[PDB]
Amino acid sequence: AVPKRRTSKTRKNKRRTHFKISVPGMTECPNCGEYKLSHRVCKNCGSYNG
Amino acid sequence: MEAKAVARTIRIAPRKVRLVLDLIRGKNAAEAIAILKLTNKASSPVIEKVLMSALANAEHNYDMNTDELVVKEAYANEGPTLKRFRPRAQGRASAINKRTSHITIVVSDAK
Amino acid sequence: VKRTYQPNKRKHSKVHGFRKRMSTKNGRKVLARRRRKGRKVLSA
Amino acid sequence: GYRKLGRTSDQRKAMLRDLATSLIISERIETTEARAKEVRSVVEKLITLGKKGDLASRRNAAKTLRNVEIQTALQKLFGEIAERYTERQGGYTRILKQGPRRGDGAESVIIELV
RNA sequence: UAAGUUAUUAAGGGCGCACGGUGGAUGCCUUGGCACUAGAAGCCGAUGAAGGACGUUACUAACGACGAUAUGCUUUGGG
RNA sequence: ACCGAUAGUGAACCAGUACCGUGAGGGAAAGGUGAAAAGCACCCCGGAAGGGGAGUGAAAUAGAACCUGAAACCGUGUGCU
RNA sequence: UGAGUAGCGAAAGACGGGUGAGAAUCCCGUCCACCGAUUGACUAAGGUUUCCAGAGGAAGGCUCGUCCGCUCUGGGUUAGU
RNA sequence: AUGAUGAGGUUAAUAGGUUCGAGGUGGAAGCAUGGUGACAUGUGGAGCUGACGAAUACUAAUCGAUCGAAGACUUAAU
Structure with missing residues (x-):
């Protein structure tokens, strides 16, 4: 079917309330010094050492 | 002081860039860099290059320390769209808007 | 599905060519009407 | 089945024979997580045949x-x-997560022989 | 201990203001049009027309000019 | 006591042309940096695009997507709720 | 606005090594898979430079692209039968 | 559907493998013998086995990071 009626920018902005992404969930590698993704290898120069 | 850097007519829709600009607005500088490095989104490298540019103008253009800066502003405005077409069934043809965007980033040392 | 236009050089020049239009009397009028307009292609 | 992989039963069995052969040839290969969790159970059962060492095991x-x-x-x-x-x-392989990849966002892992 | 009253939270939204983007209205301007007045003029062609095709420059894709003497030649006046 | 770029010729632009039709034939849309190109030497981030300076300029939110720059629309911050 | 919604046009790919700012998507390789009275070979229309080598990555390619039937620069068609 | 909700994260049995069973199929490869040969017989209900029961850390759940209280005011009673 077709929308019976136009959508306000209040209804639209409400419905985009939960449309987002989250922070990548990252730790700090204790060899590279830099940041990394937990349970993944250090994308910088380094390894896993798990 | 504040330093600023812009990237104009980036060829990505603005409401796809505003999704990842909202994760790094407010954070520190070295934290926002790692956030932009470790995210799946296609607009991550562009924002990363704009952020590194605004972090590099600070060291040289107006002398300041790059281990204190915080992302004071980060936003994306519209730019000129491109008008393409897609020929559908029964002779019709539908439009296609290729959106662009202008990414601005302002880094401040809080002073 | 066979469509309405099958290109062909001989038929095109034998029906719409300059000589065909310059042959009849209402073809000379077509040329005299296309020259007045300023068209860059009188017959093809 | 154990887990399907978007392939039909025939294309899946072929892909698993391919992956296990490549792994035992090179000894560490970069693939997708969901296939690394399936080659895990197919290469380890080949080294058991290799440890038995019969002629029925070769065949x-x-x-x-x-x-x-x-x-x-x-x-x-x-x-x-x-x-x-x-x-x-047991435990003849080990899988290591590398992260998502460009173009698919598919978690690419490395799998090797421990 | 008991009975009663009341408040901060804003995931997001509403209004007011400040600063940006988009888009190209309006203002002012005009290389060009419109409608007319007075005075030339009111035909060209088998000595090949009107109109065009192909070419010509140190490059040349196009437009003007030109025609194997070709991005032009001689001669008589102006400058 | 005509128009002033949605007007005036269809055409102020290299228009009866992109094109569109087998053909006869139909037909747009596109103006403006600055007084003078003086049209950004050089340094920095980037692979380039694009910036931030510093210079030209009376002015650079005048930088060739060039006078002015409005409304719909899209954002960022915040005062009361 | 509908809304980051419908779709992304019949089908088998896997790994290794390169190049590169960036690789599921480009180059080379081994294994596997498809057509095989045809998806193979040659020519008439019809298109009319789309063919080749060296460079490129703004737009086109229903994603990506370091690649191309796309952009730039140089080439390529030889008859007494 | 996704999440959510449940079993777990090395001070471990959560999954995969590996050893041992249940159930399934039906008597393997190789060799030996009997046949010209197709085949049959023996070792050995053998040998294979996705999801089911038990156990074992061999491999992988590493390191780490975030959120989350100091308890308002009246009146009666003690």
């Missing part, structure tokens, strides 16, 4: 490898790959 292992040259992939098994794990029981 029951020949029907899951491919015929590629290096030795053949069946002679590298029953030789080096089966001689180094002669006291180890």
